């Protein structure tokens, strides 16, 4: 199984490399060659979830058989027996093993600095270039630093 | 199964490449060569959902057999027994494995900037060029940036 | 099994080496050659967790059969029998063996010192370069020291 | 099964290509060569729905056997037993796997702009050229843009 773990590491590294390639394909025309640096971290879960759900519909029952005895005298006896049929959904789901659980991307732009408007524009391009998903916990940093 | 995961990555990359090709086929005449850059992120779910639904119709029962005893004296006894037949739908669905769960497209247009009207027109063309589906969670960014 | 433990050590060292390579790929342009030193510690758990969860939904029961006797005279007798159907989820999860449980990264920058703003900018780049995850217990130190 | 998914992608692309060919066959005479650009997105569902419906007719029962006891004395006892026969429809449907769930078409017309009347006329021709189905969720954009 350790060979499987090794190949999982390979998958994660391949994903990171592909994302880096896309980042380059976007930023190389916009910024130029050597005016930026970017690295990508991709964390992938490899669990084996397998779920079975059996759901009913309480608010729409359908009476199948029914008995109702109601006699008076004073005495009032109200017996009743009822059998129901209910909407039944049975869903069996099997999640894919390796899923990107969190994605971190950081891009540093060489100074000569960059204005806030262009930094936010680059961030907007990256959002969509990488597939930024904040609800997944992903993080995207864009900074303007001084290259040596 | 890790080979299957590798081929799933290949499928996702192929989809992204096809969408990029369509984006180019639309924008190359409109904008020109080298006046734009665009990248596409496609996230695909590969679950194995398999659902079985059994639904009834509570509001239209059909009486199959019926017994009704109603005697008086004062004393009033009202016995009743009833059997019903109901509309029964049984649907077994099996979803396709790989489905595009979210799609992100970002396009950056070289300045010399672009007016808001033409930006929105390009966005309208892309909506339909790519098959934008906001209800799916898809995202489409169109920006006017300064190429270096 | 000790061979398996040896290969686990190899996996941990490989992960550390990959993270060091990424750190170099980010900092070598920004800082230069020989102006920094960085080391990475990665602790990986290799447990064999395997969980089975059976969850219900108490607040949405669906009555399947029902009996209700309610007679008066004074005397008031209220008998009742009820059978329910409940939403039932059965999920079997099998965690991946080797998972990064804690990650420690330390970077030391050669003086001639570095201002706090640039130190924090480098820290921001590293957050995303390495995939910093404070909730996991990870730690990232960036210091400005005097190289000999 | 991933080969099946690949061939599903091929089917979708083939459908898009055919629709593009029809769009060209309509617009090339009307507008000319190089005066327009159009792209088509086709999303196809590949579920495996298989439904069985058993429907009755509550409002037209036919009495098969009947017992009716009605004695008087005062005392009035009205016993009754009744058996019914009902109209029974049993339909088993099996949907075709790949069905176009949503269709998006966008057409951009080169300026020198186009009047609203001719834009709507082109839209009317396309509606029928492509088989526009708004109830399915399809979308058709026709814009007049400035080609570079």
């Amino acid at each position: 199984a350790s060979a499987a773990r090794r190949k999982e590491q390979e998958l994660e590294r391949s994903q990171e490399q592909a994302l880096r390639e896309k980042i380059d394909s976007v930023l190389l025309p916009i910024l130029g060659y050597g005016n930026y640096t970017a690295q990508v971290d991709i964390q992938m879960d490899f669990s084996a979830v397998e779920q079975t759900r059996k759901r009913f519909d309480p608010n729409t029952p359908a009476t199948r058989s029914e008995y109702a005895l109601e006699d008076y005298n004073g005495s009032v006896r109200k017996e009743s027996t009822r059998n129901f049929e209910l909407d039944t959904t049975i869903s069996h789901e099997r999640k894919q093993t390796g899923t990107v659980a969190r994605q971190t991307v950081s891009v540093a732009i060489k100074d000569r600095p960059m204005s806030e408007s262009e930094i936010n524009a680059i961030r907007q391009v990256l959002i969509g270039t990488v597939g930024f998903d904040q609800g997944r916990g992903d993080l995207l940093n864009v900074l303007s630093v001084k290259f040596a | 199964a890790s080979a299957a995961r590798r081929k799933e990555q290949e499928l996702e990359r192929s989809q992204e490449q096809a969408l990029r090709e369509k984006i180019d086929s639309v924008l190359l005449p409109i904008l020109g060569y080298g006046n734009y850059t665009a990248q596409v992120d496609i996230q695909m779910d590969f679950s194995a959902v398999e659902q079985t639904r059994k639904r009834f119709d509570p509001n239209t029962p059909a009486t199959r057999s019926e017994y009704a005893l109603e005697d008086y004296n004062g004393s009033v006894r009202k016995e009743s027994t009833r059997n019903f037949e109901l509309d029964t739908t049984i649907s077994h669905e099996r979803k396709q494995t790989g489905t595009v769960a979210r799609q992100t497209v970002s396009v950056a247009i070289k300045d010399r900037p672009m007016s808001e009207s033409e930006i929105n027109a390009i966005r309208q063309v892309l909506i339909g060029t790519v098959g934008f589906d906001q209800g799916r969670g898809d995202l489409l960014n169109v920006l006017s940036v300064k190429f270096a | 099994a000790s061979a398996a433990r040896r290969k686990e050590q190899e996996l941990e060292r490989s992960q550390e080496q990959a993270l060091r390579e990424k750190i170099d790929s980010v900092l070598l342009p920004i800082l230069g050659y020989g102006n920094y030193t960085a080391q990475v510690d990665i602790q990986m758990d290799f447990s064999a967790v395997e969980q089975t969860r059976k969850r219900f939904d108490p607040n949405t029961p669906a009555t399947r059969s029902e009996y209700a006797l309610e007679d008066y005279n004074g005397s008031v007798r209220k008998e009742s029998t009820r059978n329910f159907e409940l939403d039932t989820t059965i999920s079997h999860e099998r965690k991946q063996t080797g998972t990064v449980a804690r990650q420690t990264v330390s970077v030391a920058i050669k003086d001639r010192p570095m201002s706090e703003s640039e130190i924090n900018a480098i820290r921001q780049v590293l957050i995303g370069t390495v995939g910093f995850d404070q909730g996991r217990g990870d730690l990232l130190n960036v210091l400005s020291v005097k190289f000999a | 099964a991933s080969a099946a998914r690949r061939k599903e992608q091929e089917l979708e692309r083939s459908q898009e290509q055919a629709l593009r060919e029809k769009i060209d066959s309509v617009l090339l005479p009307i507008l000319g060569y190089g005066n327009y650009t159009a792209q088509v997105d086709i999303q196809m569902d590949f579920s495996a729905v298989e439904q069985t419906r058993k429907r009755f007719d509550p409002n037209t029962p036919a009495t098969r056997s009947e017992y009716a006891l009605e004695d008087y004395n005062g005392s009035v006892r009205k016993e009754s037993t009744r058996n019914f026969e009902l109209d029974t429809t049993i339909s088993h449907e099996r949907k075709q796997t790949g069905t176009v769930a949503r269709q998006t078409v966008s057409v951009a017309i080169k300026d020198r702009p186009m009047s609203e009347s001719e834009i709507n006329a082109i839209r009317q021709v396309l509606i029928g050229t492509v088989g526009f189905d708004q109830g399915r969720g399809d979308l058709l954009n026709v814009l007049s843009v400035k080609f570079a």
């Binding site: 397998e50 059996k54 069996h92 | 079985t52 | 079997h92 | 298989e50 069985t52």
Partner: peptide, 17 residues
């Protein structure tokens, strides 16, 4: 386990219907 087997049997009932 037992619940998953019951789900599979329900799917088989769907197929038979």
């Amino acid at each position: 386990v037992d619940g998953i087997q019951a789900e599979m049997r329900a799917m088989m009932v769907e197929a038979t219907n």
